[PDB]
Design a protein around this ligand. Structure first.
Ligand SMILES: [Cl-]
Ligand SMILES: [Cl-]
Ligand SMILES: [Cl-]
Ligand SMILES: [Cl-]
Ligand SMILES: [Cl-]
Lengths: 247, 246
């Protein structure tokens, strides 16, 4: 958007849970954003599963994902999560966050084309070192909350450097709540619990369409205890509720 | 859609409510459809607000709807329903069924382009007589339950004679339930209570994407009393539940 202002009153929801994190919320019509922590809003972290958004688009663009209705066949091998042990649509693989499906997509896209698309998308530090199938999971790729909102705004407007149809296909795959005058697109992320001095990161990013308004959001937090994960949704929902958006 | 088979065991949900109607359900992977009433499955009825689906695609195709994020401004004058007395997005206008918005779209599309597109879409009897802004509401346009599922299948597959991008836009506008492995696109219709010896029609049409399967559906029923309106959703829902479609 245009402006960003720091709203320190938004710390109340973080301090109540002893969480270190940031929430960025932008209202389209007023071209204005608010955040609890300006400094952290610009700090870059591992995207983890939020990378499914650009990866899905790049997969379609390059033709690795053949079309909108491609089925990703479970081959029979045990997977890290139980919910991934089945055939999945593109929307399904995004929604249940089936990481191995996307690791294979990334391998097929390749280094040259992945690099070019992350440049076109202005996606974070654009550092894809750490292996083609994990740079966004444990490698060197980093993105800020502000950069996520910018990327999501471009996607909403079909202004990414990709076909309008591929942007649309990925947008329907991101729908997480549908009501007559309320629509939510969103995606979670979780890198793990980390180590001594290096906590992991949790994400919730997306946008809310309410009546004729649109609000873009990005949340992240430091995490070293997996039982704290639901906070990645509860904190932003509480803040958006207080704003009259209602999460 | 493939083959169609009459299954009279579905009549249970209709007889319970003294409803004269039809449900058509098609399973994409098996290329087969079932219905409680083969005769009625092919009978053609006023589309009523189910017409918002092709009308929206046509509005986008012709540039009358400038793009995905066009806002339909309320002029501040009375509208039939309070829910319509506000600015609406395309999705909002479809979801609250803001008929006056779509009537102005039809006027701006105009007769020639509207006729051409309904032919291209093989949309019912393709009869647009009765006024450019009311042919699907009180005029001569008629479409069957079988034709609705055929049209919806084409939309799902992006195979209508329109840009893939415009078909995609109208598809997101139609989403009515979203879950990680369960997605519903749907649209209701209701022509009114009819006249003596001539009931109105109520519709519910759409599709269900469940894991990797897809089910297309079209329901219609005779209606002469507004109190019966919720049956247009409850009957099909009960049948789809009995079929294990979540
Ligand atoms: Cl991933
Ligand atoms: Cl009106
Ligand atoms: Cl209408
Ligand atoms: Cl009329
Ligand atoms: Cl209803």
């Amino acid at each position: 958007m245009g402006s960003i202002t720091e709203n320190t009153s938004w710390n109340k929801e973080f301090s109540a849970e002893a969480v270190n994190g940031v929430f960025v919320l932008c209202k389209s019509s007023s071209k204005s954003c608010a955040t609890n922590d300006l400094a952290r809003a610009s700090k870059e972290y591992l995207p983890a599963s939020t990378f499914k958004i650009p990866n899905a688009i790049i997969g379609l663009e390059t033709g690795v994902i053949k079309n909108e209705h491609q089925v990703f066949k479970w081959d029979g091998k045990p997977r890290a999560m139980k919910q991934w042990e089945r055939d999945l649509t593109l929307r399904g693989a995004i929604q249940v966050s089936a990481t191995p499906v996307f690791q294979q997509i990334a391998r097929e896209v390749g280094e040259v084309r992945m690099q070019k698309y992350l440049k076109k998308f202005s996606y974070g530090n654009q550092n894809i070192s750490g292996g083609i199938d994990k740079f966004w999971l444990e490698g060197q790729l980093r993105i800020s909350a502000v950069n996520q909102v910018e990327f999501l705004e471009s996607l909403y407007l079909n202004k990414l450097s990709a076909s309008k149809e591929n942007q649309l296909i990925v947008k329907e795959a991101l729908v997480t709540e549908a009501a007559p005058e309320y629509l939510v697109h969103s995606k979670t992320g979780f890198s793990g619990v980390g180590t001594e001095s290096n906590p992991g990161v949790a994400w919730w990013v997306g946008w809310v369409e309410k009546e004729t308004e649109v609000y873009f959001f990005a949340f992240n937090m430091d995490i070293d205890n997996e039982s704290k994960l639901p906070l990645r949704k509860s904190i932003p929902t509480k803040i958006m509720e207080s704003e009259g958006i209602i999460g």
